[PDB]
């Protein structure tokens, strides 16, 4: 499977479990949803890509982090966190982690 | 003006100049553009809000960093960088910096 | 500006980290010599961390005493303190070293 | 899973930083004390950085020799090297310290 994401809560140093994440493909107009899943107990979704071959182009994962903090009775600057990325080789592995705090985050292409 | 953004290029330790940044307002499960501007020689847009009172709700600034890198013949993982945030109080200041590399970034509410 | 500014933004509150002790040291042979110590102000800033002596080129270290900052709030942190080592290759320039801070994560960089 | 792992991701390439020297030191009574040194593999990893000797609680630091890493590519960096200090309260636990590296900025955290 060509896409994995995970969330590490930088305030606890522990994974953010049970966080909804969506995957969309950029279309000519707007976006098209490909999948949705929730991070597991290790804050991971190891296989977020649906059962379909990928094409080169732009994609967007959206980590629903607002809800995750809301459940802890915590406020956050971000209602959710979209990350847009480009696939240029269709059978490569893509890894998009999120390092999360209430009022800041980091994301990168992981190994 | 209630919204400032700036971009620091972590690969040079210098500001990212002449980068286009849009501002959108959330409305009916879609987004509406309110303004667009370019970071100055210091990587800043001091006054990104249009000349109209802000309303509470969710907003999205989109840093056009894919284009910034492509002009330098540098590949980037991200075609652009959207950041969504809540504006709960219409008259206070919102500062949304971006720390930028080709394959990673950080954003946060600034002071 | 002063040759050296530092500030701390608490990423968990989205507000500056006030009253955090920060030291400045110069590399001296295989060790370090303290040049100054100061505390972030109410905006999380130390606008002028260099003491009133001429800065020389070479390597330096700021240590953000963040373990203590979190301990006062009865919060645990992975880092007892956070050292950042950097170059001062040119004494005619301004050096800005921000710290973006969480209990189990941080970022630092050369700012403007 | 080892008491201590570290890895480096070069955020300018989106690829691991290979063959980077990393030391590990303990905060002993007589000063900082080297316990081990190693080099990241082709995946940017040192999965087992602890020496064979039993770990105790206390303060430790890893120093990623990134200055050298960039100098081999004829690239400048703000940091001669990057120290990261951290607490080990439970010797039975796994401690992971990734470094996300750019020439003029980095991020670190306690990983899973
Ligand atoms: Zn992962
Ligand atoms: Zn959204
Ligand atoms: Zn693309
Ligand atoms: Zn992966
Ligand atoms: Zn992979
Ligand atoms: Zn700014
Ligand atoms: Zn977009
Ligand atoms: Zn909102
Ligand atoms: Zn501001
Ligand atoms: Zn402000
Ligand atoms: Zn500052
Ligand atoms: Zn120290
Ligand atoms: Zn130097
Ligand atoms: Zn400055
Ligand atoms: Zn690792
Ligand atoms: Zn050192
Ligand atoms: Zn300790
Ligand atoms: Zn690990």
Please name which ligand lies nearest the alpha carbon of D58.
17
Q: Are the CB atoms for C86 and C97 separated by under 8 Å?
A: yes
- Report CA D1 to chain centroid distance, whole Å: 17
Q: Nearest-CA neighbor of A67 among A22, A10, A14? A: A22
Strand spans (E) along chain B: 3-9, 14-15, 20-27, 30-38, 44-45, 57-63, 81-87, 94-101, 104-108
Q: Nearest-CA neighbor of C86 among C50, C112, C110, C55? A: C110
Q: Is D13 close to B102, i.e. CB distance below 8 A?
A: yes
* C-alpha torsion sign, points A34, A37, A43, A47: negative
**Binding-site residues of B for substrate:** 6, 44, 108
Q: How many other CB atoms are there within 10 angstroms of residue B28's CB atom?
A: 6
> D103: alpha, beta or left, given left = phi > 0 and alpha = psi -120 to 50?
alpha
**Per-residue tokens: C51:** 């003491």
From chain C, pick out residues whose CB is under 8 angstroms from the CB of B43.
112
Radius of gyration, CA atoms only, chain A: 14
Cα–Cα dist C18/C68, whole Å: 12
- Report CA C111 to chain centroid distance, whole Å: 12
**Per-residue tokens: C31:** 């060790």
Q: Is C44 close to B15, i.e. CB distance below 8 A?
A: no
Whether residue A105 is annotated as binding a ligand: the answer is no
Q: Is C109 close to B43, i.e. CB distance below 8 A?
A: no
Cα–Cα dist C7/C40, whole Å: 7
Our count of domains for chain B comes to 1
Q: Domain containing B105 — which CATH number?
A: 2.60.40.180
Q: How many other CB atoms are there within 10 angstroms of residue A109's CB atom?
A: 21
Radius of gyration, CA atoms only, chain C: 14
| Bridge partners for B85 per DSSP | B59
Q: Chain A: residue nearest C103 by CA?
A: A11
Per the structure, the complete domain to which residue D41 belongs is given by: 1-112
Q: Are the CB atoms for B67 and B48 separated by under 8 Å?
A: no
What was the elucidation method?
X-ray
Residues of D within an 8 Å Cβ radius of C? 59, 61, 77-87, 102, 104-110
Q: Nearest-CA neighbor of A46 among A17, A1, A4? A: A4
Q: Chain C: residue nearest B13 by CA?
A: C110
Cα–Cα dist D79/D101, whole Å: 11
Cα–Cα dist C80/D60, whole Å: 9
Cα–Cα dist C20/A11, whole Å: 18
From chain B, pick out residues whose CB is under 8 angstroms from the CB of A77.
85-86, 108-109
Q: Nearest-CA neighbor of B39 among B67, B11, B73? A: B67
Q: Chain C: residue nearest D88 by CA?
A: C78
- Report CA D62 to chain centroid distance, whole Å: 4
Q: Are the CB atoms for C83 and C97 separated by under 8 Å?
A: no
Nearest C-alpha of chain A: how many angstroms from D52?
26
Q: Chain A: residue nearest D11 by CA?
A: A108
- Token pair 């597991």: residue: A40
**Per-residue tokens: C21:** 């002790």
Interface test with B, best of C10, C20, C97, C109 (most B CBs within 10 A): C109
C50 CA distance to ligand 16 middle (Å):
20
Q: Nearest-CA neighbor of C108 among D36, D54, A106, B44? A: A106
Q: How many other CB atoms are there within 10 angstroms of residue C49's CB atom?
A: 22
- Tell me the CA distances in angstroms from B16 to A98, B65, B99, one per residue in order: 23, 9, 10
Q: Is A111 close to D43, i.e. CB distance below 8 A?
A: yes
Any chains having at least 3 CB pairs less than 8 A from chain D are A, B, C
Cα–Cα dist A11/C25, whole Å: 29
Whether residue D87 is annotated as binding a ligand: the answer is no
From chain A, pick out residues whose CB is under 8 angstroms from the CB of B101.
108
Strand spans (E) along chain C: 4-10, 15-16, 21-28, 31-39, 45-46, 58-64, 82-88, 95-102, 105-109
Q: How many other CB atoms are there within 10 angstroms of residue B77's CB atom?
A: 24
Please compute, for residue C88, the number of CA atoms within 13 A of its CA located in the half-sphere on the CB side.
24
Whether residue D69 is annotated as binding a ligand: the answer is no
């Amino acid at each position: 499977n060509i896409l994995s994401v995970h969330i590490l809560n930088q305030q606890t140093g522990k994974p953010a479990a049970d966080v909804t994440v969506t995957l969309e493909k950029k279309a000519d107009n707007g976006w098209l949803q490909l999948n949705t899943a929730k991070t597991d107990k290790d804050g991971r979704i190891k296989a977020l890509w649906p059962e379909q071959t990928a094409t080169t182009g732009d994609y967007r994962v959206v980590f629903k982090t607002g809800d995750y903090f809301k459940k802890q009775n915590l406020e956050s600057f971000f209602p959710e966190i979209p990350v847009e990325f480009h696939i240029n080789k269709v059978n490569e592995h893509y890894h998009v982690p999120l390092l999360l705090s209430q009022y800041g985050y980091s994301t990168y292409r992981g190994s």
